[PDB]
């Protein structure tokens, strides 16, 4: 959450993607946000913060 007022527009679009998308569907974002998309939006990413391969 990013604070004279609130800015909560970073959890709208993970819960959109949890409610309104079919359950086997791949998301392709840059590797900084890999853990949050898998944890909070619950889909199957292509990269994450491990930088293994």
């Amino acid at each position: 959450v990013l604070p004279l007022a609130l800015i909560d527009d970073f959890r709208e679009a993970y819960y959109w993607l949890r409610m309104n998308s079919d359950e086997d569907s791949k998301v392709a974002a840059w590797w900084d946000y890999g853990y949050q998309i898998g944890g909070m939006a619950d889909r199957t990413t292509l990269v994450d913060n491990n930088t293994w391969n």
Partner: protein
């Protein structure tokens, strides 16, 4: 060979996003997806970038054909695009978008095209 960072810089080596950006920066895939409807938002047809502190005019961003916008959040912080499914007749997805988007350039043009042999 395919990608080189000598091309995203302007003349005499400055990185910027303005109306004098590069020719291969304006045609990239992460430029078109960020500044899509950003000049049509503000009044008069001009906009401030608020971070880079540069000014954008609605002729500087071309339209994309192969993707389409599905959800865009409140303060324009996360934007979600979707791959458009392939064309059911073999046509390239740039040509159908150019056919729909530009109903001008009518002509007769009776000339035989230059094709290869049907094998």
């Amino acid at each position: 060979e395919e990608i080189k960072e000598r091309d995203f810089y302007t003349a005499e080596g400055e990185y910027r996003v303005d109306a004098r950006a590069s020719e291969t920066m304006r045609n990239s895939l992460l430029y078109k997806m960020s500044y899509k409807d950003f000049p049509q938002l503000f009044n008069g047809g001009q906009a401030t970038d608020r971070v880079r502190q540069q000014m954008i005019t609605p002729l500087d961003v071309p339209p994309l054909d192969y993707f389409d916008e599905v959800f865009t959040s409140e303060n324009w912080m996360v934007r979600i695009y979707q791959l458009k499914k392939d064309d059911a007749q073999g046509r390239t997805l740039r040509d159908v978008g150019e056919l729909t988007r530009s109903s001008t350039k009518t002509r007769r043009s009776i000339k035989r095209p230059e094709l290869g042999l049907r094998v």
